[PDB]
Amino acid sequence: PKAKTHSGASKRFRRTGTGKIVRQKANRRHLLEHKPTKRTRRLDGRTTVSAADNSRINKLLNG
Amino acid sequence: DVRPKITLACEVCKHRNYITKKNRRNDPDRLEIKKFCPNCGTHQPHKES
Amino acid sequence: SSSRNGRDSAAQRLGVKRFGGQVVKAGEILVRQRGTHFHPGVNVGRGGDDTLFALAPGAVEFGAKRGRKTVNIVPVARP
RNA sequence: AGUUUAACUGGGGCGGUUGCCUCCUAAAAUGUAACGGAGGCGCCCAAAGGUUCCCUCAACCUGGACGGCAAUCAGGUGUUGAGUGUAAGUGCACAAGGGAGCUUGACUGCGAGACGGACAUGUCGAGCAGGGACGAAAGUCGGGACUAGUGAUCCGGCACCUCU
RNA sequence: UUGUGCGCCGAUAAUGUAGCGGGGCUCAAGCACACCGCCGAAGCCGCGGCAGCCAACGUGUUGGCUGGGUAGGGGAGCGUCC
RNA sequence: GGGGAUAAGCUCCGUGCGUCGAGAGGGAAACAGCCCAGAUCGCCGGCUAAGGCCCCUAAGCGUGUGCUAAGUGGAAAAGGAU
RNA sequence: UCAAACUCCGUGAUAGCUGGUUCUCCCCGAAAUGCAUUUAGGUGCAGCGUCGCAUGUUUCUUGCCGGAGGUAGAGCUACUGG
RNA sequence: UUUGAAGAAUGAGCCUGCGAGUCAGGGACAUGUCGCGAGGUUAACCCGGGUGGGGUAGCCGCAGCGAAAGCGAGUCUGAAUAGGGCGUAUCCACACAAGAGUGUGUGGUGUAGUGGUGUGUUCUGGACCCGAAGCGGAGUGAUCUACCCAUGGCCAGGGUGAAG
RNA sequence: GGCGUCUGGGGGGAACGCGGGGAAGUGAAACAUCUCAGUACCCGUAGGAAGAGAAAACAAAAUGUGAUUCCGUGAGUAGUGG
Numbered sequence: 001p002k003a004k005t006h007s008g009a010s011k012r013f014r015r016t017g018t019g020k021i022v023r024q025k026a027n028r029r030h031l032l033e034h035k036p037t038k039r040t041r042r043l044d045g046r047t048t049v050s051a052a053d054n055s056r057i058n059k060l061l062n063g
Numbered sequence: 064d065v066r067p068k069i070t071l072a073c074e075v076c077k078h079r080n081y082i083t084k085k086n087r088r089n090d091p092d093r094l095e096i097k098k099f100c101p102n103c104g105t106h107q108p109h110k111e112s
Numbered sequence: 113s114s115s116r117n118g119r120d121s122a123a124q125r126l127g128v129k130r131f132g133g134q135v136v137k138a139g140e141i142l143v144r145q146r147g148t149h150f151h152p153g154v155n156v157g158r159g160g161d162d163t164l165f166a167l168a169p170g171a172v173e174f175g176a177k178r179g180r181k182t183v184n185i186v187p188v189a190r191p
Numbered sequence: 192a193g194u195u196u197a198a199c200u201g202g203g204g205c206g207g208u209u210g211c212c213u214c215c216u217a218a219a220a221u222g223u224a225a226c227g228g229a230g231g232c233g234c235c236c237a238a239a240g241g242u243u244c245c246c247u248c249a250a251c252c253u254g255g256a257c258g259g260c261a262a263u264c265a266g267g268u269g270u271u272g273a274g275u276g277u278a279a280g281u282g283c284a285c286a287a288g289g290g291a292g293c294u295u296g297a298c299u300g301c302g303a304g305a306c307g308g309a310c311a312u313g314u315c316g317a318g319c320a321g322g323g324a325c326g327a328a329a330g331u332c333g334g335g336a337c338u339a340g341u342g343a344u345c346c347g348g349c350a351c352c353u354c355u
Numbered sequence: 356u357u358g359u360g361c362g363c364c365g366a367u368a369a370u371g372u373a374g375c376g377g378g379g380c381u382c383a384a385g386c387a388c389a390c391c392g393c394c395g396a397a398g399c400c401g402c403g404g405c406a407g408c409c410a411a412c413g414u415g416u417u418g419g420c421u422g423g424g425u426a427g428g429g430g431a432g433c434g435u436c437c
Numbered sequence: 438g439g440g441g442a443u444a445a446g447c448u449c450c451g452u453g454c455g456u457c458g459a460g461a462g463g464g465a466a467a468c469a470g471c472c473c474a475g476a477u478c479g480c481c482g483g484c485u486a487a488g489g490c491c492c493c494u495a496a497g498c499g500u501g502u503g504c505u506a507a508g509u510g511g512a513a514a515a516g517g518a519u
Numbered sequence: 520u521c522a523a524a525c526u527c528c529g530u531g532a533u534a535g536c537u538g539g540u541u542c543u544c545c546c547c548g549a550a551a552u553g554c555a556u557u558u559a560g561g562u563g564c565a566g567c568g569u570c571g572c573a574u575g576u577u578u579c580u581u582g583c584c585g586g587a588g589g590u591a592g593a594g595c596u597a598c599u600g601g
Numbered sequence: 602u603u604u605g606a607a608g609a610a611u612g613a614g615c616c617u618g619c620g621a622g623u624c625a626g627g628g629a630c631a632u633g634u635c636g637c638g639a640g641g642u643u644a645a646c647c648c649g650g651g652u653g654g655g656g657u658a659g660c661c662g663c664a665g666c667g668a669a670a671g672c673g674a675g676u677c678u679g680a681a682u683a684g685g686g687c688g689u690a691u692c693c694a695c696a697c698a699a700g701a702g703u704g705u706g707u708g709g710u711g712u713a714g715u716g717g718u719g720u721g722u723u724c725u726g727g728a729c730c731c732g733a734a735g736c737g738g739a740g741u742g743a744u745c746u747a748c749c750c751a752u753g754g755c756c757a758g759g760g761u762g763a764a765g
Numbered sequence: 766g767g768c769g770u771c772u773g774g775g776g777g778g779a780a781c782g783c784g785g786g787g788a789a790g791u792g793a794a795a796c797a798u799c800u801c802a803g804u805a806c807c808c809g810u811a812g813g814a815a816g817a818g819a820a821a822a823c824a825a826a827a828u829g830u831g832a833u834u835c836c837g838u839g840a841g842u843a844g845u846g847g
Contacts, residue, residue, distance in 0.1 A: 001725050002841050003628050017665055017688045026311065026343055033068055033082045034341090037333065039313090041301075045678090045686065052310055052564055063629035063724060066235080072350095079350055083297065085237065094237075099298045099322060102351085104680080106298090106323055114207040115226055121212050124338075125307055126281095127221055132586035138701050139304035139316060143587090146337055147282030150587090159315045161337055162282085165305075167317050169701060174586065178285085181587095190700060 009060035014046065021057055022046035071109040073100040079112060132174045135188060136166050142183055153177070153184035 014022045025043045032040060049057055065088060071081040081098060094111040128150075130142045142164045143150045152158045153175060155168040170185040 001626055001628065003724050004841055007846080020687080022687085027313095029344075031342070033084075037298080038316095047686095050310060056563085058630075059723080070350095077350095081298085083237090086235085090237065096237085096297095097295065097323085099296090101299050101321095104299090104322070106295095113226095115228090116207085117228060117230090118208075118226075119211095119230090120214095121339080123222065125221060128587050129221095129306060131220090133584085134586090137304055138318095141304090141306050141315065144306065144315085145281075147280085148287090148336085149281065157317065161315070163306080163315050163337095165316065172586085 003063040005063065006060040009057065013049065013057060013061060015061075021049040021054060021061075023049050069094065069111045071096060071098060072112050073098075073103065074108040074110050076100065076103055076107075078102060080109060085111075130172050132172050134172050135170070136172055136185070137169050138167065139165055141165050142172060149181065150174075151180050151182045153182040155185040155187075156183050 012023065016022060024046060027035070028040065028043045066084045066086055068082060068084050070079050071083070071094070072079045078100065080100060085094060094109075096109045096111075097106050098109040099105075100107040100109075124144075126144045126146065128143045130136055130140060136142070141159075142156065144163050146162060148158075148162055150164060152164060155166060155170060157165055157167050159165055164183055166185055168185060168187065170187045173184050173186050175182050175184050
């Protein structure tokens with residue numbers, strides 16, 4: 001039997017050229033009238049995932 | 064709701080640009096504000112929708 | 113018979129983050145404070161929440177002026 | 192017929208609590224628990240925001256038509272005991288407190304460097320560019336003296352885009 | 356009268372002395388201050404065997420430090436069958 | 438330090454504090470958490486730590502100067518007492 | 520055998536639960552904390568162990584030097600209260 | 602199994618047999634060893650009484666960025682040579698700017714992967730072994746017991762004395 | 766409808782086929798959507814195999830394939846999903 005890649009993790013994370021794992025930030029979907037532009041500006045773009053959960057994420061994406 | 068969220072639209076190109084709140088009971092009328100219109104590239108009067 | 117107390121906020125981790133005699137880059141936060149206990153001096157800028165930071169690299173040095181605590185930065189010498 | 196009907200709890204129940212902000216416990220860095228001791232919030236302001244300029248209270252003493260402890264006036268003393276939209280603390284008289292003129296930076300694109308953290312969040316940010324406000328100029332302005340006034344993701348609505 | 360070192364009374368439970376471990380001790384074997392020895396452990400030393408880490412040189416010896424251990428991680432082995 | 442009655446072998450915290458947990462050996466009569474000290478193995482050798490040296494019990498009914506009459510030593514309070 | 524009978528089958532039902540898991544030596548050796556939790560006797564991340572690689576004393580101890588506090592203490596015509 | 606048991610906490614009467622991390626997959630990650638090496642390798646299938654020979658369809662590596670159109674040692678965002686994000690294996694020399702932490706250029710060095718297979722964890726499977734109360738599908742049961750239906754049988758002896 | 770007469774059926778079988786009906790334990794750390802699964806079981810039916818089969822098919826501007834069935838890839842990808 002093959003190993004089924006996790007559907008949710010496959011739709012949220014990415015692999016870059018070197019093998020990094022990136023992710024998007026939260027708190028940017030709704031209820032953002034009162035969030036100043038500084039908060040929203042720092043909340044966009046892909047960020048390398050923390051090394052705390054880098055072990056679990058590799059297991060999900062690769063298997 | 065006393066302070067309902069309102070949005071501001073550029074008077075020239077009618078782009079809904081900003082969103083603030085105001086006291087409807089204190090200012091029942093619409094809001095006259097000049098703001099930076101990004102696509103126009105120059106400050107244009109902004110109308111609350 | 114019950115207690116009406118027991119509510120508390122998180123601990124905000126204020127204090128002096130960088131102490132005197134330390135080398136700081138530009139922008140490093142020196143003190144995290146609520147009021148102006150420490151006041152900005154030379155090459156020290158005040159943040160929005162009265163957080164102090166550094167505009168120029170150098171070594172911290174606490175000082176006083178007109179009976180007010182101040183924080184300064186001395187321009188450490190290039191090798 | 193298939194199921195759901197929470198947890199903490201000096202056994203369980205009844206009672207009370209569940210998030211955020213401030214103070215003491217907290218042992219002079221940061222942090223630190225208990226059904227320990229006290230309070231507040233789920234807002235408000237189109238000016239109570241930005242900027243330029245000017246000013247200094249509270250209290251007491253003396254004298255004044257109503258007017259008296261206290262209303263407005265004059266004089267003197269008066270370094271902070273008044274006041275700061277709102278709880279407490281840290282601040283502020285050089286004012287962040289009182290008043291006046293103009294105005295919308297309560298911006299767009301970004302952001303070196305940091306604080307704090309299991310992770311997710313959260314916070315400060317000099318400076319560059321565009322286009323502005325006040326100011327003679329230096330300059331200040333990416334909301335409010337600061338810290339609370341809030342809800343991840345999925346799903347869906349509206350407007351714009353040189354995408355398919 | 357004051358300050359001190361030792362004491363007395365206050366004192367008082369239910370199987371059997373029973374609030375020194377026992378015997379016993381004031382001819383202290385009790386208390387305080389100085390002095391002298393000794394006994395005491397798997398501690399330290401002596402003599403010998405083994406192992407791990409490292410170093411010195413060498414074609415594996417020598418030397419130095421180290422070797423309690425549950426959950427648990429690593430290395431190397433005995434025994435059985437085909 | 439908080440709660441409790443400034444009670445608990447109580448409960449909740451802090452501590453480049455300890456030990457037990459996960460730890461043998463000597464002492465405290467017996468006695469995880471106290472005191473001395475971290476067990477590589479052997480020896481019918483030696484020196485010590487805490488603790489002891491009248492007999493049980495190893496080594497002192499040790500030396501000098503005193504104090505106690507209560508077996509104090511070998512449990513205790515306000516207070517009483519030539 | 521009855522608050523829903525018996526037998527076979529799904530079926531080796533599923534249990535954040537109790538029990539059990541077998542030969543040896545050598546080296547190293549923890550935790551009972553933090554955050555979150557339909558969560559508190561479970562689990563995820565972090566903290567503490569071991570093995571490999573990389574970097575080398577950056578770790579640690581002591582002296583000296585530059586720092587900021589607001590406890591112990593103390594003080595009150597220096598504030599708020601008693 | 603516990604903070605702690607010789608424990609008056611649990612289990613074992615004794616002996617001998619039997620009784621618990623295994624297997625599948627071109628699975629995933631990591632680490633050894635072997636082959637080839639900018640390449641490595643076949644699957645299905647065909648030919649051989651064999652373990653051998655053939656089999657290029659595919660897979661991994663060989664260029665990245667971006668939602669995508671696309672561009673390409675660059676690319677995205679952006680009005681921007683204006684900063685930032687990801688990337689150009691890494692190292693060495695030399696120049697040029699900074700000493701807001703170094704950066705940019707030239708030159709050299711040159712890039713290592715992939716197939717078996719051993720081991721450790723892991724995925725789907727009952728997945729280290731033993732153990733429920735109960736849940737569904739199809740059937741067996743009223744010879745015991747509850748009720749009913751058809752047809753039979755039994756009730757010693759002695760009193761009281763209704764209607765008529 | 767009744768007669769008379771000829772030919773057929775009926776039942777069994779381990780697996781494989783085809784067309785119908787169709788759960789629950791379980792996973793979701795609860796659970797109803799969903800999964801378990803069109804699985805277990807039941808029904809009707811043949812055969813030595815059955816079913817499918819000769820384009821009202823793919824395809825994408827190539828002057829391409831050319832009935833069905835069965836293996837390997839495509840691929841745990843495009844997608845779908847409280």
